[PDB]
Curated annotation (Swiss-Prot):
Tissues in which the protein is found: Widely expressed.
Full protein stretch here: 3 to 244 of 1173
Gene name of the record: CTR9
Function: Component of the PAF1 complex (PAF1C) which has multiple functions during transcription by RNA polymerase II and is implicated in regulation of development and maintenance of embryonic stem cell pluripotency. PAF1C associates with RNA polymerase II through interaction with POLR2A CTD non-phosphorylated and 'Ser-2'- and 'Ser-5'-phosphorylated forms and is involved in transcriptional elongation, acting both independently and synergistically with TCEA1 and in cooperation with the DSIF complex and HTATSF1. PAF1C is required for transcription of Hox and Wnt target genes.
Positions of TPR repeats: 39-73, 127-160, 161-194, 196-229
Compartments where found: Nucleus speckle
Descriptive protein name: RNA polymerase-associated protein CTR9 homolog
Quaternary structure (record): Component of the PAF1 complex, which consists of CDC73, PAF1, LEO1, CTR9, RTF1 and SKIC8. The PAF1 complex interacts with PHF5A. Interacts with KMT2A/MLL1. Interacts with STAT3. Interacts with SETD5. Interacts with ERCC6. (Microbial infection) The PAF1 complex interacts with Zika virus French Polynesia 10087PF/2013 non-structural protein 5/NS5. The interaction with viral NS5 proteins may reduce the antiviral immune response by inhibiting the recruitment of the PAF1 complex to interferon-stimulated genes, thus preventing their transcription.
């Protein structure tokens, strides 16, 4: 599955951690602290815990790295941005799910303070702006502000999947659903391996754009790729029942069920081998 090398300080040796053998989160931290490990390694370990579903290990690694992650290397700043923006992004995703109103407000505060201090390191780091953009969507009428940040990212990186998904969502909420569908379609064409929820959001465009048919094929492709996908079950199970447009207004979450993943750098990595599979190729016509 993989391993990571931890340079032992004042030595030419190294200790390997096997990812299938991931130690207790708390002892890893004392190791990286003891060997004054550079920040970039702390982050690598933390994301691996995130991938293995070991979430509190991931949180505690990166919070610890803010104190004892060594910065004695060129481009450490970019790693501080990754560390702060990934902490912030995670707290936001906990905030959406959390039901204690008081607890949720604390998560938001933590994300706010993290983004504010990441502002003072690399003001315009692409990932950072994607974080602030999605954070604008989280709540406000910061829709215009989020739109400007997403749009600026595509004026540097036209194929950036998070920015396209962000533009699609904003397009939909201002009810330009041809534009929202185009954005979603470009996301999926560009990165055939993208999350199942991309077709979910295409579904909702395919519903408001009165193309009821592919709307169902979109929702179905989502459940095929992740049978847990709920807003698509909701989606299909309201194609049952024939303005008409409104009943489809309030089953749709504001993020149209499409969460933009700012934590796992893999979610939109583009393997040149993965090819468009015909069920998506039909939705793209």
């Amino acid at each position: 599955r993989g391993s990571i090398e931890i340079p032992l300080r004042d030595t030419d040796e190294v200790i390997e951690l096997d990812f299938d053998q991931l130690p207790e989160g708390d002892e890893v931290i004392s190791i990286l602290k003891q060997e004054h490990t550079q920040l970039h390694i702390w982050i690598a370990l933390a994301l691996e815990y995130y991938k293995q579903g070991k979430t509190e290990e991931f949180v505690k690694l990166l919070e610890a790295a803010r104190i004892d992650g060594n910065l004695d290397y060129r481009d450490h700043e970019k790693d501080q941005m990754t560390c702060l923006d990934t902490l912030a992004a995670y707290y936001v995703q906990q905030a959406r799910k959390e039901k204690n109103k008081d607890n949720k407000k604390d998560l938001i505060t933590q994300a706010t303070l993290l983004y504010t201090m990441a502002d003072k390191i690399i003001m315009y780091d692409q990932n950072h702006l994607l974080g602030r953009a999605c954070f604008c969507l989280l709540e406000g009428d910061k829709m215009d502000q989020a739109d400007a940040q997403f749009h600026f990212v595509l004026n540097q990186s036209p194929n950036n999947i998070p920015a396209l998904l962000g533009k699609a969502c904003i397009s939909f909420n201002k009810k330009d659903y041809r534009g929202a569908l185009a954005y979603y379609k470009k996301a999926l064409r560009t990165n055939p391996g993208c999350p199942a929820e991309v077709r979910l959001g295409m579904g909702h465009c395919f519903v408001k754009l009165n193309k009821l048919e592919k709307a169902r094929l979109a929702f179905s492709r989502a459940l095929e790729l992740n049978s847990k996908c709920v807003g698509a079950l909701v989606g299909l199970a309201v194609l049952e029942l024939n303005e008409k447009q409104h009943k489809h207004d309030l089953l749709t979450e504001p993020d149209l069920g499409v969460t933009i993943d700012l934590i796992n750098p893999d979610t939109y990595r583009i393997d040149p081998n993965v090819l468009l599979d015909p069920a998506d190729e039909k939705l793209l016509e």
